[PDB]
């Protein structure tokens, strides 16, 4: 029932001459905004993606990032010269806040380098990873020496971040509370051993990500029931496949049980024969 805000940032620096920075934002499991290196504005996908903020409470933010986009790039360009970093460069930044019931919450700001995070933001000062290289330490000093930025960030994690979330939940509850009924079926998989076959349980086109699915013999949960990873789709409804290796003679009375919020106890009744 928790819906964290994940602001995602991707910035690649192949050579000194060329770079691109794009970013987006996830709430819980939904995308609201896209932002290219080509666009001077962040794109509100939903009509309610703007939340409660007026076109000025909104544009104000666009003024910051647009400057922040330009600002961030030179820094790292000169950063690398100070730090002698063999190009190319890949930097990722995960950030946001998550609210607790009532008027309490917590924030975060995790930056990563070449698929390995470097530093975070604790309280009112920059703090590196306990498993971070040293050069990061000298870099930690430099950034802490720009306070207005340090302040500018707390003003966002502390405070302004959560209010906007509240300005979205009231604007997006309808989409938020939406539920989608899955579409399930069965199919044969190639045999993983002699006689013993692989029984596949298919689930597709549902909404709220979290679901529990197990292959069962009426009511007996089958250990061999193995499933893969939940995977997306174009309209935000996901997909999943659960498998099981059993012998043909044991396929009598077997059934795949499907448990998800979209139905409440009217589970997908699929015994072996459909």
């Amino acid at each position, epitope marked *: 029932r928790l819906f964290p805000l994940r602001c995602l940032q991707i910035s690649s620096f192949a050579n000194s001459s060329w770079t691109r920075t794009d970013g987006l934002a996830w709430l819980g499991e939904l995308q609201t905004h896209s932002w290219s290196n080509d666009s001077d504005t962040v794109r509100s996908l939903k009509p309610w993606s703007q939340g409660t903020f007026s076109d000025q409470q909104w544009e104000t933010l666009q003024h910051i990032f647009r400057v922040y986009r330009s*600002s961030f790039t030179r820094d790292v360009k000169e950063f690398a010269k100070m730090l002698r970093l063999s190009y190319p460069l890949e930097l990722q930044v995960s950030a946001g806040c998550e609210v607790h019931p009532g008027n309490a919450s917590n924030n975060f700001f995790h930056v990563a380098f070449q698929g390995k995070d470097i530093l975070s933001f604790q309280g009112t000062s920059w703090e590196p990873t306990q498993e971070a290289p040293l050069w990061v330490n000298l870099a930690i000093q430099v950034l802490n020496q720009d306070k207005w*930025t340090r302040e500018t960030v707390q003003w966002l994690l502390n405070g302004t971040c959560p209010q906007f979330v509240s300005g979205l939940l009231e604007s997006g509850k309808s989409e938020l509370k939406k539920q989608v009924k899955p579409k399930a079926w069965l199919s044969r998989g190639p045999s993983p051993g002699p006689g013993r076959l692989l029984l596949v349980c298919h689930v597709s086109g549902f909404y709220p990500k979290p679901v529990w699915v197990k292959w069962m013999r009426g009511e007996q949960e089958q250990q061999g029931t193995q499933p893969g990873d939940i995977l997306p789709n174009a309209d935000e409804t996901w997909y999943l496949r659960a498998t099981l290796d059993v012998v043909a003679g044991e396929a009598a009375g077997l059934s795949c049980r499907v448990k998800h919020s979209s139905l409440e106890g009217q589970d997908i009744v699929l015994y072996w024969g459909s």
Partner: T-cell receptor
Amino acid sequence: NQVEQSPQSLIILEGKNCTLQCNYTVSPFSNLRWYKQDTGRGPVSLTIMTFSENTKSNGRYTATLDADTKQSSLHITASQLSDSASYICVVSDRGSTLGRLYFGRGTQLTVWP
Amino acid sequence: DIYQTPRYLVIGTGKKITLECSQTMGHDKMYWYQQDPGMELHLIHYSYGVNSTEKGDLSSESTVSRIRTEHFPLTLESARPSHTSQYLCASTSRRGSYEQYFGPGTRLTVE
């Protein structure tokens, strides 16, 4: 240029008070610095005002700043003879050790007795 | 403090240039500037660290080297009259009151 300084040359009397202005167009902005170069010697750091710090003084010198109009001034009082040198207006477009420095064309004054 | 030698110097065209600088405040970053008399300032090189040496907005034939934190001496291979100006090693502290500190300066003349 991204930082215009005014006026170029000015002449005043000993014991008088006058002002030095500086106008900048640089985006972004972090801090403003007025410097004083002794003729034939290295210039010296005087006022180092962030954009919150509107005013600041070091002795008989008192500089001002209005970032909203992107305009700096510099007030000195009771001009002594030793005040005669060239004066500069410097802006850093970052607060940490990465900002490019945007010097003004430079003004020079003369305090006559 | 911050020291750079020598205040004055004169040499023949096409010869190699002796330019020194020293610093006793342990600052990591140092500078070099070019000012022609009566005109404004111009940046030419800088070093963010001990092993860094970078070029500035003005493309010039200078030879900015830095192998030591204290010494940040500039060198120049071949002399030429258009180089006649003043040159100012500079320094800043790694933390707070970034009072850009300047050296005394050196006067350059070179047929």
